């Protein structure tokens, strides 16, 4: 520290508060902007309705297409873009089918070579995608 007086606690406190406000994580966690602009709104999982299935491309050093869906939310109705994880699971998703989206790994940040997608799907038609992969459960009919 710099201020080393015996009767100095206030300058230390106010300077520590100001330099704590001059941060990124403490600025993010204590303002209403970073939660008001958050699509999940401080929630881990969310439900939604798929409207379109759009394949977005990869980044520079690798070449692929990435299978994604356009999901509108139920609680606030905004439009996000999810990402179906596994191989060949887009055939289980039909128009206007309810899904369960979740986080993608880096706390509201784009992960890997997929540009601009921060969410991924876990369950579709109120059954898990893993059980549809492993041949354990069947979609209701």
């Amino acid at each position: 520290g710099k201020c080393r007086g015996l009767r100095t606690a206030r300058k230390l406190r106010s300077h520590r508060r100001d330099q704590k406000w001059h941060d990124k994580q403490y600025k993010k966690a204590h303002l209403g902007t970073a939660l008001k602009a958050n699509p999940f709104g401080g929630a881990s999982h969310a439900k939604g309705i798929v409207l379109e299935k759009v394949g977005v491309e990869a980044k520079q050093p690798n070449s692929a297409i990435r299978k994604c869906v356009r999901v509108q939310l139920i609680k606030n109705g905004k439009k996000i873009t999810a990402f179906v994880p596994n191989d060949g699971c887009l055939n289980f998703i039909e128009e206007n089918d309810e899904v369960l989206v979740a986080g993608f790994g880096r706390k509201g940040h784009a992960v890997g070579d997929i540009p601009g997608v921060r969410f991924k799907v876990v369950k579709v038609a109120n059954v898990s995608l893993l059980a549809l992969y492993k041949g354990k459960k069947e979609r209701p009919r």
Binding site: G55, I65, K67, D87, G88, C89, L90, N91
Partner: protein, 57 residues
């Protein structure tokens, strides 16, 4: 071909073979007993770098 970016293409075209029928593996305490056995008390003093259990070169 059909098309380029088909979903489930490789796994759909992958040859389908099943499991091989085998006995059950020892689970619980005897799994650790066999692990300690094979790892420690059935060794010989070799030289050089040790070989991994999955070395099949």
């Amino acid at each position: 071909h059909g098309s380029l970016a088909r979903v489930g293409k490789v796994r759909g075209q992958t040859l389908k073979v099943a499991k091989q029928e085998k006995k059950k593996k020892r689970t619980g305490r005897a799994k650790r007993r066999m692990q300690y056995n094979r790892r420690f008390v059935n060794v010989v003093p070799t030289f050089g770098k040790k070989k991994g259990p999955n070395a099949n070169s």
